[PDB]
C-alpha cells in the first residue's frame, strides 16, 4: 500500500532545430529568429526625413541644374538617389566627385 | 545535457503536460493525476527571457558611413573600402554564430538543470519515506492521498507524520 | 509607415540583433551578417520519444 | 545558479562567516560553533584568481597608428579612417560586454558548484549516520562531541564507529 | 571541474583502463575485473567530435584583398591599410584565444559531467542494495557473482532479487 510520484517535463510533437557548441542540429521545443531576412520593399518616410532625389543626383542639385532647382535650400536626414537620375546642363566633371558628394550628404 | 535529467534518467518528455514546463504525475489510492510545477517552470522561463532580452537589446545606430558598392573600377582606395567592409562582416558573422552556439548550449543545460533541481528538492522533502526508482519517479512507502500528494507539490509535506508507516513498509 | 532602419531594399524591422538584407544601412539597424537564419533556443530539448 | 545550492537549498549566506567562503555550523552536546572550510574556500578563490589573471594579462602594445580626430572636412579618405575606427571600437565593446557576461555567469555557477561539492562530500563521509534535512544541514543520529565534529570537518570521520548507535536512533 | 567527480571524489584516473574513457572495476567472490562502459565513453567522444567538427568547419575563401607589405614609405593611405590589417589580426587572435579557452573549460566540464552521470545511474540501479563509499565505489551488500556484476554493467540488474539479503547485511 503506497503511491508513486514521477517528475517530468513537457514536449511537443515537433519542435525546432538549433545549433549548439557540440551539435550542428539539435531539437528544442521553441526558438526565435535572430536574423532579419525580409523587407516590405519600401522605405518608410518616418521617423527620418527622406528626400527623394527623383531625376537628380545630389551633385546636380548642389550645382543647380535647372531641372533639379526644385531642391534649392532642401534638407534631409537621408537623400535617396534614383537610378533614373540624369544631368541636363553643361557637361561637367568633379575631381574627387565621391568626396564632394559625401561631405554634402553628411 | 550536463545534468543527465532531460533525455537522461527522465526517459522522455510529456506531450500531455500542456500547462507547464516541469511537473508531477502521480498514482495513489484515489487514482492518477498530473500537475505543473509553477516555480521551476517560471525559473526556466525567467532565465530564458533574461538572455533573450539581453540579446535583442540596443541595436547600434549608424548614420553616414562608407560606400559599399561601386560602379567603376578604382584600384587601391576602393580595394581598401571593400576589404574593411568584408572584414567587418566576417567578424560580425562569427560573433553571431558563436553567440547562438553558446547561448543554446547553455539553454539546454539550464533547463536540464532546473529539471534536476526539482527532482532533488522532492527527494529531499520525502526523506526516508520514499525511494528513487531511477527513472525520475519516487516510490512512496505509505498511503498518500490527493491532499498528501498536494502537500508534496506545494512544499509543506511533513515526513515525520508518515515515517513509522514508511519505514515499516520499506525495511520489514 | 514608421521604421528606424532603412536599407536600399526598403525598410526593415530592428527587433532582431542581426540582418541579412543589405550591408548598406542607415539608422538603428541590426548588424549585417552572412547567415540567412540563426535560431536562439527559447525552450528545453524536445524529447517526445525515448 | 545551475547547482541549486547557493540561493537554493541553502536558503541564505552567513554574514557571520568572516574567515572563509564556505564552512560549517554545528550544534552538539558541547554547544554550537562555526568553522571555515579551507579547501573549498581555496578552490573557489583559486579559480577566480585564475580567470582574473587570464583577463588582466597582456595589454597590447601599439605605436604609430592612424589619426582619429580631424580638423578639416576631407571626404572619402577621412570617412574610411573614421569608419575603420568606429568599426574597431564597436567590435571590442561587444567583446568586452560578452566577456564579462560569460565570466560572471560562470563565476556564479562555479561558486554554486563548490558549495554543492562540499555538501555532497560531507554527506558521503556520514554514510548512514546522518540524514539530509533538505536545507543544507545534516541530522546526525549519534552523540557527536567537538572532536567528532572536527573529525568530520577534517575528513577523517570514521562512520563505522558510530554506525550501530546511529541506525538504532534512525530506524528503531 | 564543476561536478567534482574527475579530480574529485574519483581520486585519480586509471592508466590501466585502456578500452574506454569510463568504466567499472569490481571485486567479488570470483575475483576482480575491469570493463569499459561503452555508452558513457561514446557520449563523451561524440560530444568532443561534435565540437571539433564545428570548430574546424569551413575556412573562409578570399581572393583579391589589399596589400599588407610595402617597399616605399607613403604616409596616410599606407598608414590606414596597415592599421586595418593590424586591427583585423588583433580581433581574430582574440577570437581564437577566447574560443579555445571556452571550449576547453566546457570539455573538462562535460567529461566530468559524464563521469558523474554514470556514477549516479549505477547508484540508482543499486537502490537499497548498496552504499556509496564516497570515493566513487559502491559497497554491494549481497553475493554478486560475475554475471551479477555484468547485470549491473549492462543495465538489467534487478534490485528486488537481492533486496532481502542486502538489507539483512546492511541493517542487522
Ligand atoms: C536587397 O538588395 C540587394 C542588392 O541589390 C540584393 O543582393 C543581390 O542579390 C542578388 C540575387 O541574390 C545577387 O545576384 C546580387 O549579387 C546581390 N547584390 C549584392 C551587391 O550583394 C538582395 O538579394 C536584396 N535582399 C532582399 C531581401 O530583397
Ligand atoms: C498544500 O496542500 C495542502 C493539502 O492539499 C493544503 O492543505 C495547503 O493549503 C497547501 N498549502 C499551500 C501553501 O498552498
Ligand atoms: C582531525 O580531527 C581529529 C579530532 O580532534 C584530530 O584528532 C586529528 O588530529 C585531525 N586530523 C587532521 C588531519 O588534522
Ligand atoms: C546482461 O548481463 C546478463 C548477465 O550476464 C546477461 O544474462 C544478459 O544477456 C545481459 N543483457 C544484455 C542486454 O546484454
From Swiss-Prot, chain A:
Glycan attachment sites: 14, 30, 73
Domain of life: Viruses
Disulfide bonds listed in the record: 56-68
Identification of the protein by name: Hemagglutinin HA1 chain
Organism in which the protein naturally occurs: Influenza A virus (strain A/Hong Kong/1/1968 H3N2)
Gene that this sequence comes from: HA
Residues of the full protein shown: 27 to 130 of 566
Amino acid at each position: 500500500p503506497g503511491a508513486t510520484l514521477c517528475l517530468g517535463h513537457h514536449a511537443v510533437p515537433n519542435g525546432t532545430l538549433v545549433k549548439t557548441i557540440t551539435d550542428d542540429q539539435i531539437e528544442v521545443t521553441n526558438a526565435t529568429e535572430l536574423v532579419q531576412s525580409s523587407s516590405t520593399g519600401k522605405i518608410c518616410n518616418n521617423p527620418h526625413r527622406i528626400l527623394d532625389g527623383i531625376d537628380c543626383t545630389l551633385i546636380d542639385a548642389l550645382l543647380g541644374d535647372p531641372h533639379c532647382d526644385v531642391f534649392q535650400n532642401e534638407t534631409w536626414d537621408l537623400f535617396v538617389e534614383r537610378s533614373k537620375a540624369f544631368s541636363n546642363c553643361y557637361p561637367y566633371d568633379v575631381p574627387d566627385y565621391a568626396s564632394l558628394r559625401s561631405l554634402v550628404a553628411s | 545535457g550536463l545534468f543527465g535529467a532531460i533525455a537522461g534518467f527522465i526517459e522522455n518528455g510529456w506531450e500531455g503536460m500542456i500547462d507547464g514546463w516541469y511537473g508531477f504525475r502521480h498514482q495513489n489510492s484515489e487514482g492518477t493525476g498530473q500537475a505543473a510545477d509553477l516555480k521551476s517552470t517560471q525559473a526556466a522561463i525567467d532565465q530564458i527571457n533574461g538572455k533573450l532580452n539581453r540579446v535583442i537589446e540596443k541595436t547600434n545606430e549608424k548614420f553616414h558611413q562608407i560606400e559599399k558598392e561601386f560602379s567603376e573600377v578604382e584600384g587601391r582606395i576602393q580595394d581598401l573600402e571593400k576589404y574593411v567592409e568584408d572584414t567587418k562582416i566576417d567578424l560580425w558573422s562569427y560573433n553571431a554564430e558563436l553567440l547562438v552556439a553558446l547561448e543554446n548550449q547553455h539553454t539546454i543545460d539550464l533547463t536540464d538543470s532546473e529539471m534536476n533541481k526539482l527532482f532533488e528538492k522532492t527527494g529531499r522533502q520525502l526523506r526516508e519515506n520514499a525511494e528513487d526508482m531511477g527513472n525520475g519517479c519516487f516510490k512512496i512507502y505509505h498511503k498518500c492521498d490527493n491532499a498528501c500528494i498536494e502537500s508534496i507539490r506545494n512544499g509543506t509535506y511533513d515526513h515525520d507524520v508518515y515515517r513509522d508507516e514508511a519505514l515499516n513498509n520499506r525495511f520489514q | 509607415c514608421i521604421s528606424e532602419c532603412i536599407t536600399p531594399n526598403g525598410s526593415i524591422p530592428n527587433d532582431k540583433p542581426f540582418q541579412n538584407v543589405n550591408k548598406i544601412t542607415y539608422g538603428a539597424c541590426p548588424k549585417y551578417v552572412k547567415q540567412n537564419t540563426l535560431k536562439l533556443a527559447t525552450g528545453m530539448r524536445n524529447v517526445p520519444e525515448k
